[PDB]
Structure formats: C-alpha cells, structure tokens
Design a protein around this ligand. Structure first.
Ligand code: EL5
Ligand code: EL5
Lengths: 482, 482
C-alpha cells in the first residue's frame, strides 16, 4: 500500500498494556510459552522462571479453581489478592492465550446498561431525524462509560471521515462537523477493526510491557495479538493522542451490513480503564445503532421511491392523453425535472434537442451528445463532476456540474440527459489535510501532525450526488419513452 | 358484530391479583381513597380503618423514604419486613395509584438479560428466514422467564391469529401452526393491549381481591385499572386458561409501526410470578424483535422491487428493438407474467383481446372486461377472490381466482389484466371455529369453548394475495404501454 502508515504490522508489535497480564500455553501439558514481563505483578514469581512450566504450577490457586468455567465459556471472574480480575481465553498461533484484566467493580452495571439499551431500542428512536439517533447513541455511550468526550465518526467513500455527532462534558473541546484524513486510520487498522470491533487504550502515556520471549520460538516473529484485549497500539497513534491532549481512548466499530461504516470514538483527559463486561455492554449499544440506522435508511429510500413512482404515474397519465410527446413533455416540465432532482433536461428524440429548464446552449448539448454516444455505458450514465471527464463543459459548473443520461434507443443516439448545477461545499478539516503527517528528514520515521485546528476548504464544480432514487426514476422514464 | 365479548369493561372490574397490594391517594394531603381488601398483610391494620388517612400514616417509613424517586421514576425497590417489594406509581382518575408486588430476588437477572439481548442482535439475526428470528425470540423469552410454553402469535387482517413459532418444555403440548378465532382476544382487549403492552396472570385459579370501596366515591364507578400491573383480568378469560390447562399466563404486545402486530404469549402449567424488573427485560426483547422484523421486511421488499424493475428494464430494451407490440409481448411472454407473479394475462390494446399464457376464454374475458369499466377504480383494480365479486367466473377458480388490472387510458376501456388460479390452503383451527364460545340458554352468560383440538378447513377459490411489489410492477407496465 501507499504510505509507510499502511505498512506497520500493528498485530505484531509484541507489547501489552500495563494494567493486565498475558500468558500463552501450548500442548497437552499447557506449558507456558509466552508471558508478559509484568507477570510477577500478579503471580509472585519472576516470569522468565516460569517459561516452560505446566499451567498447574504457574497460575495462582484462585485462577486454577476457576479453570473449568474459564475453558468452557472463555471468560470468568476471579478474585486475587490484588483484587477482582476478568480472565479471558482465546487462541492465537496454536497457543491458548490467557489475559487478565481488572474486573468490573460496580454490581449494578448490567442494570444501568439494560436501562440505556431501552433508550436506544425503543420505537420512536429517530423521530426527528437519524441525527437524533446518532446523538442518542453518543449520549448513552458517554453515560455508560464516563468518558469526557464521545464522537460518532462516519467514513466517507474515500475513507476519510467526519464527526456527525458528539456528546462531551461542558467546557471541553469538540470536533463536531470536522473532517479527518483517511491516513488517520490506515488500511491495516481498518482491516483489523472490521474483525475486532472494540479497543481500549487505558493510558496513552504509558509504555508497553514486552512479551517474553520477544518471538514465538516456532515462528520467529511475535505472538499475533489481533484478538488480544490487552494489545498495545501503534506508537504513532499514541503520539497522535498526546498531540490531541487525550489520556485515554476507547473506540467501537460501527458495522452496517458487513462493511465498516464508521466508529464510535471516546476520549478521556486522564487515564481511564473500562472493564471488559462494560465494553461488551457498550458493543450492544453500537449493534443497536447499526440496526436502527438500517431500518430508518431503508424506510427513507422506500418513501423516496414512492415519490418518484407517483411522479412517473402522473407522467403516464399525461401521456395517453392529448397531443404529441413534445407537447405533454412541455406541460410536464417540472415533473420531468423533479424525477431526478434536476435543473434542466435535454431530450433527443430524433430532431433537434428539446431543451427544458436550465441547460447549456444547443451547440454545447449536441456536442455533449456526440461524445456520450462514444462512451462505454449501456443504459445509464451519471457523473457529479462532468468537467473532470468532459472538459468542453468544465467552465459551465453553473448549469452542468452533474449530468444523468439514459439511452433511449439501442444502436442510435436517442437520450434524455438531466443536468445539475454545482453546490459549493465548505469543508472544515481538523488540521491542514495537505500535511497529514510530519516525517523526519530521510522519511523513515513518521510523526502525527501537531495541530488539529480548523482548516477550511471550499469544494467547487461538483453537483449533489446522483442517488439510488434518481437512478431508478431515470430508468422508469426510459421505459416510458420506448 | 359487537357481541357480549366486546362489551365487558375489563378495566373496570374492580379487582386485583392476590400477590400484590394497591393503594390510591388523592389531594395534597395524599389521603387514602381506594385500597385492596388484602392490604392488612402489608400495613398491619385492617384496610377499612385506613380510608381517609394521610399517606404519612398508612405507609411504612420504608416506602415514604423513597417517595421522590418513586414519583420521578415510577418505580423503586423497597425492603419491608415481609421482604423485598417493587413499588410502582401511576395516576388514574385523578388519584395517585401505588402498587406493591414481590421484587426480583435474583441478583444476576440483568446480566442474564443482557446476554439474551445479544442473541437477538448478534451480527445479523434471521439470516435463515424470519422464521428463525421468531424462534430465537420465543427461545430467549422462555429462557429469561422460565415459562413452560412460549408462543409467537400473529394477527391476520381480520384479527384472527395463528401461532408462528413456539418454544416449549420437553413433552409439552403445543399450538404451532394453529389458528384461533378473533373473539379469543376481543376488540376492547386489543385496544387495551395497544396502550399497555404487558400483562401477567400469576395464578389462573386464584380469586380476585376486591378494592375498597367498590367505587371511587366522586365518580360512582370502579377505579380505572388500565395501567395497573396487578389488575385481575376478565373472568371468562380465566375460564379459557383453565379450559386450556394453564395455571399462569404472561403476554407481551408486539408493536411494529404503531399497530398491534401480534403477541408473545407464555403459559405455565403451575402458578408462577415474574417480577416487574424481569417483565421489563422481556419487553426489551419484544421491542428488539419488532425492530428486527421491520429491518428484514424492508430489505425483502426492496429486493423484490429490484427484481420487478429488472423485469421492466428488460421489457423496455425489448420494445426498443423490435417491431410489433403483440410480437414483442409474445416473445417476452413470461417476463410479462413474472412482473406480477401471474399465470396469464389479457392485453386489451383495443382490437382483439390478446391473451398470453393461461387465461379465460376470449368471450369470458371480454365479459369481465365490460364489467370492469363500470367499477370505481382509477388506475388499478385487484382481488384475490374474483368469484365472490364477479359470479360469471366463480366456476373458473382454475385460472382466475384472482385478477390484477390496470387502465391503459382514461376514457375508453383499454386494460391489461393479470390472472392467478386458486391456491388451496389447509388451516388447522384450535377447536371448531363455528362454535367459538359456549353461551348459556338465554345468551346472557358466555363461556369459552371446551375443546382446542385441531379442526381442519380447506380454503378454496382464493389466489395468493396481491403484494405491493405486484401493484408496483403493474403500474410500471402501465407507464410503458400508454
Ligand atoms: C475525532 C476524530 C478521530 C480520528 C480521525 C481518530 C483516529 C484514530 N486512529 C486510530 C488508530 C490508528 N492510527 C494509526 C496511524 C496513523 N495516524 C496518523 O495520523 C498517521 C500519522 C498514521 C500513520 C503514519 C494506526 C497505525 C492506528 C492503529 C493503532 C492500533 O490499533 O494499533 C484510531 C483507533 C484507536 C482509538 O480508538 O484511539 C482512531 C479512532 N481518533 C479520533 O478521535
Ligand atoms: C395460542 C393462542 C392463544 C390465544 C388466541 C389467546 C387468547 C388471549 N385472550 C386474552 C384475553 C382475553 N380474552 C377475552 C374474552 C374472550 N375469550 C374467548 O374465548 C371468548 C369466550 C371471549 C369473550 C366472549 C377477554 C375479555 C380478554 C382480556 C382479559 C383481560 O385483560 O382482562 C389474552 C391476553 C391475556 C393472556 O396473555 O393470557 C390472550 C393471549 N391465548 C393463547 O395462548
């Protein structure tokens, strides 16, 4: 991939966060093969002395007492001299991996979680826009977590993102409405965050605890920490958080029909650890949000489709009525433009173009037609920045920044072309997107950018996007023109 | 017709169930106005002596201590000498109504409930049919409640219902696939269950506890118990449960888009109390099922619409390619029938009725064509039981149990008419639906039927129902033809 940013093997860094301990066992005897260097902080004896020992000799009695429920269901609460810990089991590189993390301290956590679950699963959740849906998701994640700032971050189609909603405590910086470069979350991280939907950075200023030995002996590379709850994250991201002034970070993947739609991102000014069970309660919330957004969005498309079909039905009724085609198309101009949310339409029915509403002049349309006929499309063609692909009209963003053309005949030049003007857009980036990172001389060590202050950009020469309903309506109009 | 069943005022029966206590207070001194006759077991004094007393002198300190969160939140847990009770507050008839019932005793209840909530969100529940979505909902409610039998009951358009899914104890009888008369849940019950979505019948053999006095003195009728958790239900429904052999019953209304879609109904063979907290956890599951059903239904309808529009788009290509309409329509014969899932179609392009596939004879179609013009519809007409509306073809259920017609011109009678044959359906009723009740001589006392054994009816002369995708595709074909 492109940058060095994509290259970092973030699952193979060999470090865990200092609040927990990791032990990896293999074979029928469960011999300890990999252990974190801090494992005396919970186990009494120096970790290097425990490599190669059977599990029954390294683990405390309190954990061994819970060994059967641990293996059975992969997660158990254990009470140690150092306090209550959550034990977690997964498999990686042929090893059984055991992680221990401080356990939830509030007995009423699940009751509180079930209550905020109600606030989001309730019907009527969305009855002032999906914006109120996102705001409620952010508010309830903040209530359950205690984090200073909770943001809903949506990926655009180039994988840069923007903050759509935000819940933060009074008197605190926010990022609402700002855009962030795709490189802020590089492609291997997005990959990992698609299969591992949660991640906690409990203290952005702490140093990672290394694993011992620093490679798995059979493999000659570090233990694969893809599914580790304790995995220490990229040093470059830790720098990024410090540059933002955040001491703890917790984010959750928003998966909507298989793809990474966005994130719920949380920041705290100070270190803060959330328990495993509290993180899993937060993940229920995000899966509810994904579900509410799908149902709302499909309802919106259906309503839009119904509106287009009503327009088509009225056009059909006006046909099969009086006069010629050009006459009914004259009377029904506003419906024909409304079909695709357009400001003008060129109808090429054989003679000269029929120009309805706001369109470029006849000579320019006939020229556009000559060129569309050569293009490699089948029934529909659309673009929201015509000037990039057809520079003869690149100056005419006022009437022809976007077009939608349907072919009305097989091997002949018969078309309906709808036009849209540009819509200027003011983007506010969190820092200068032209310098998304700060490499050292030589370009071997990368740093995050230093500032996230607003940096404004205006986008010109692009129309509103051609949406699914526009495309469906154009096909319906084609079928009516035969 | 408003039988005896529909007129019983089930919210004004004046009784509560024996496992709880109800008090109602009025005015700023909160004087006791109504009280259940069993209240000595909680108040220490005979209830008649407490009427007219201020709340501060009827309620133990334990309840008064929590008055403000009770008023703000509507429920609190209070620990009394008898044990832990849930206190529930609402307003009725200008009185403050207090209800007390035994509280949840399992500390881990909310943690278990959060675990079954995850089952119903998961990645994508219902990947193998909404049938498995309904099953998972019955299974999780049964797991959370411990009821012997849990059933998903859907209302049909005539408000009779059928059991679509069932989760039950081993060796238990069931009602899967069976149909029940609409009078089993009469119209005022359906109305109440739209407003109050939960109801528990903890012991179907127990007798109701009367309220004291039997009327609200200001009003001259019983206290309105619409929103009471302890309300004793209709005596004829208690007889219905006993005829079924059930000792306890619990049901949740399924509201999908504001309308009563169905019920999750639970039966226990012995008496069984479920706490308020546990009932509210079940309500989360039902609102989750409703949300899942809407998301999947909207997806299925979008997918069907997409198929119909592909069919129309192939019809458009074919017409813009060939000469004769009747030739293209002949060549494309089965796409034209697939449009509405039909077995024949009559195309009235003026001259001779063109008949494709499986249709009535030319004389017979010209007959219903003449009848169709003088009917009150603008663009489309459809029925799935043509014989009951147009007797000349009642004997032709083999080709024309259902029709769908669109008008291809305003004045004059140019139509396209799709035809469907009957589909015979075998439905099993729970008891003979001709005797849905057993009235006594004089027809003033009604009883429910005594038997629920399968009673089998085959429905004839009706097609598969015309769906919204069918109507949509026909409208699109109309636009392609005028
Ligand atoms: C409000 C907007 C907002 C945004 C847009 C935001 C970004 C964000 N980045 C990450 C993670 C990573 N970033 C990078 C690399 C680079 N980042 C750069 O700028 C350049 C210099 C670069 C490389 C050259 C890597 C390798 C990882 C994976 C770390 C790991 O998992 O090991 C995360 C998830 C972790 C978390 O929740 O804190 C988030 C949420 N956090 C916010 O709040
Ligand atoms: C497997 C399928 C299945 C069905 C289809 C089913 C029916 C059902 N009925 C009810 C309630 C009532 N029924 C009646 C009246 C009559 N019932 C008759 O038969 C005739 C004689 C009649 C009048 C002449 C009234 C007034 C009420 C309101 C009671 C109240 O709230 O006060 C309920 C809710 C309560 C609950 O979950 O147990 C259910 C779930 N219960 C099942 O499991």
């Amino acid at each position: 991939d492109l940058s060095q940013c994509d290259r970092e093997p973030i699952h193979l860094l060999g470090g865990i966060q200092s609040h927990g301990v990791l032990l990896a066992f293999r074979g029928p005897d469960r011999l300890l093969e990999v252990v974190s260097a801090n494992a005396q902080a919970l186990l009494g004896r120096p970790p290097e002395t425990l490599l190669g020992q059977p599990v029954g000799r390294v683990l405390p009695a309190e954990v061994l007492a819970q060994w059967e429920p641990l293996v059975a269901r992969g997660s158990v609460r254990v009470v140690l001299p150092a306090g209550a810990y959550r034990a977690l089991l997964h498999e990686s590189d042929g090893l059984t991996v055991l992680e221990l993390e401080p356990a939830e301290l509030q007995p009423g956590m699940e009751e509180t979680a079930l209550e905020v679950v109600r606030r989001l699963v309730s019907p009527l959740a969305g009855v002032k826009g999906t914006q109120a849906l996102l705001q409620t998701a952010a508010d309830t994640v903040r209530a359950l977590t205690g984090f200073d700032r909770v943001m809903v971050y949506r990926f655009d189609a180039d994988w840069h993102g923007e903050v759509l909603a935000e819940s933060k405590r009074g008197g605190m910086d926010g990022f609402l409405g700002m855009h962030f470069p795709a490189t802020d979350i590089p492609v291997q991280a997005r990959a990992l965050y698609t299969r591992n939907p949660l991640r906690l950075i409990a203290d952005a200023r702490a140093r990672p605890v290394p694993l011992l030995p620093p490679v798995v002996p059979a493999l000659g590379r570090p233990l694969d920490l893809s599914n580790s709850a304790l995995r220490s994250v990229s040093p470059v991201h830790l720098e990024y958080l410090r540059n933002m002034g955040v001491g703890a970070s917790f984010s959750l993947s928003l998966l909507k029909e298989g793809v990474l739609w966005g994130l719920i991102a949380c920041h705290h000014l100070e270190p803060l650890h959330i328990s495993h069970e509290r993180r899993r309660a937060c993940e229920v919330l995000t899966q509810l949000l994904a579900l509410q957004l799908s149902a709302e969005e499909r309802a919106a498309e259906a309503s839009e489709d119904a509106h287009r079909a009503a327009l088509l039905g009225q056009l059909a009724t006006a046909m099969g009525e009086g006069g010629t085609l050009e006459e009914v198309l004259e009377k029904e101009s506003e419906r024909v433009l409304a079909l695709t949310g357009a400001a003008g339409v060129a109808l090429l029915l054989g003679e000269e173009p029929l120009l309805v509403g706001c369109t470029p002049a006849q000579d320019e349309v006939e020229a556009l037609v000559a060129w569309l006929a050569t293009q490699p499309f089948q029934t529909s063609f659309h673009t929201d920045r015509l000037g990039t692909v057809y520079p003869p009209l690149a100056a005419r963003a006022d009437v022809a920044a976007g077009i939608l053309a349907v072919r009305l005949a097989p091997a002949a030049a018969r078309f309906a072309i709808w036009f849209r003007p540009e819509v200027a857009r003011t983007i506010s980036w969190a820092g200068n997107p032209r310098k998304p990172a700060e490499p050292e001389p030589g370009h071997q060590r990368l740093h995050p950018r230093g500032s996230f202050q607003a940096w404004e950009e205006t986008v010109r020469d692009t129309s509103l996007p051609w949406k699914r309903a526009d495309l469906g309506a154009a096909e319906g109009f084609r079928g009516a023109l035969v």
